[PDB]
């Protein structure tokens, strides 16, 4: 079936949605600098119950009009303000294979860019429109959270142990 935004409406293939989390404790997805990066290159998760993070432009090579779960997806942050040292960095979500905390989700140009597609999958015990992203390199692996130890940042990563239940909200 088609993936529903929080307003029970399906996600438009190529639209822009906020990727909120189920637990109100945290917030939305956004790029932030981490470890040794002068540019905000780590797709992170806010901890503020009020920051809806950055807008993502979900999309599939498949020309259908809405996003159906099980279809290959390509996630991309909408243009967001950065420093002069970063204006021009690519915005597409990627997965750099082999990093301490496991395959991390990073934006910008990254050498060890693993080939594959994202895919959404419903989880919710038939209540809200709760989904989870998975990565299937070209079987699949969920996308959970690996807390930055020496910092605290909720870095996005593929973790079997735990996935990341998220819910979208149209931008406009």
């Amino acid at each position: 079936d088609f993936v529903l935004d929080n307003e029970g409406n399906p996600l438009e293939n190529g639209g822009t949605y906020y990727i909120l989390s189920d637990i109100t404790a945290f917030g939305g997805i956004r790029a932030a600098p981490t470890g040794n990066e002068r540019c905000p290159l780590t797709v992170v998760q806010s901890r503020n119950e009020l920051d809806k993070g950055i807008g993502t432009i979900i999309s599939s090579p498949y020309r259908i009009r809405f996003i159906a779960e099980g279809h290959p997806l390509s996630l991309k942050f909408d243009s967001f303000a950065v420093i002069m040292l970063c204006v021009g960095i690519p915005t597409e979500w990627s997965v750099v294979e082999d990093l301490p905390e496991g395959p991390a989700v990073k934006i910008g140009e990254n050498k060890d860019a693993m080939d594959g597609w994202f895919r959404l999958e419903r989880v919710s015990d038939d209540e809200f429109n709760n989904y989870k992203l998975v990565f299937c390199p070209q079987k699949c692996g969920d996308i959970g959270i690996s807390i930055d130890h020496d910092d605290g940042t909720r870095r996005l990563v593929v973790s079997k142990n735990k996935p990341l239940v998220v819910q979208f909200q149209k931008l406009d």
């Binding site: 079936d1 293939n13 020309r63």
Partner: protein, 223 residues
């Protein structure tokens, strides 16, 4: 469709619309009761609208009919996108007339450079999204395999053709899948995929119907 132009009224009579809450794909009527389209458009409940021009207004020439059978090709691969083709059986044969005709199945495969007509109510903007009321038309030639493969290395199967411009500008998009690519009064392609739309060095990838005449013709005869 992006870069095309608004089709005239009932210019393409055989074109349909897969509706399930709202337009999400298209198709093409081949005989009074069946509808061929992209297999990735499969959905449990489908309403095949016909005789449509402006899909937002009831012009009183359309026929809304539910699908009864929706058979996706046996060897269709959701992963590799190969064999993106399905047949939909109208639960009541349409009334073939002026505003509702049927496109002919291909007698042979389309040669490179053969010009074609693509239509759909899919997105009109390269960046952003503008969904039309009226059906859109596009004139694009069927690119050579030697060329197609180059643009999508490792992804082109024996069943996919490329049709468009390596220069960008005119292409199909979200909301056109399942639709026709009609060449010389013969159905020679079904919208299936691409990377973005009208992007440079990325033409659209279309299912090669000509590799399905025997399947189609058997399935309909069998069901």
């Amino acid at each position: 469709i992006v870069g095309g132009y608004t089709c005239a009224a009932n210019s393409i009579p055989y074109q349909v619309s897969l509706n399930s809450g709202s337009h999400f794909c298209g198709g093409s009527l081949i005989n009074s009761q069946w509808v061929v389209s992209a297999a990735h458009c499969y959905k449990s409940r489908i309403q095949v609208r016909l005789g449509e021009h402006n899909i937002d207004v009831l012009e009183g020439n359309e026929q809304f009919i539910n699908a009864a059978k929706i058979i996706t090709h046996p060897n269709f691969n959701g992963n590799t996108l190969d064999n993106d083709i399905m047949l939909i059986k109208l639960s009541s044969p349409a009334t073939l007339n002026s505003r509702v005709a049927t496109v002919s199945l291909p007698r042979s495969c389309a040669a490179a450079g053969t010009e074609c007509l693509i239509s759909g109510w899919g997105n009109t903007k390269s960046s952003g999204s503008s969904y039309p009321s009226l059906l859109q038309c596009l004139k694009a030639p069927v690119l050579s395999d030697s060329s197609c493969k180059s643009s999508y290395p490792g992804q082109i199967t024996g069943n996919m053709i490329c049709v468009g411009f390596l220069e960008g500008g005119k292409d199909s998009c979200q909301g056109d899948s399942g639709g026709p690519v009609v060449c010389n009064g013969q159905l020679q392609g079904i919208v299936s995929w691409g990377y973005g739309c009208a992007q440079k060095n990325k033409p659209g990838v279309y299912t090669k119907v000509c590799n399905y005449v025997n399947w189609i013709q058997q399935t309909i005869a069998a069901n």
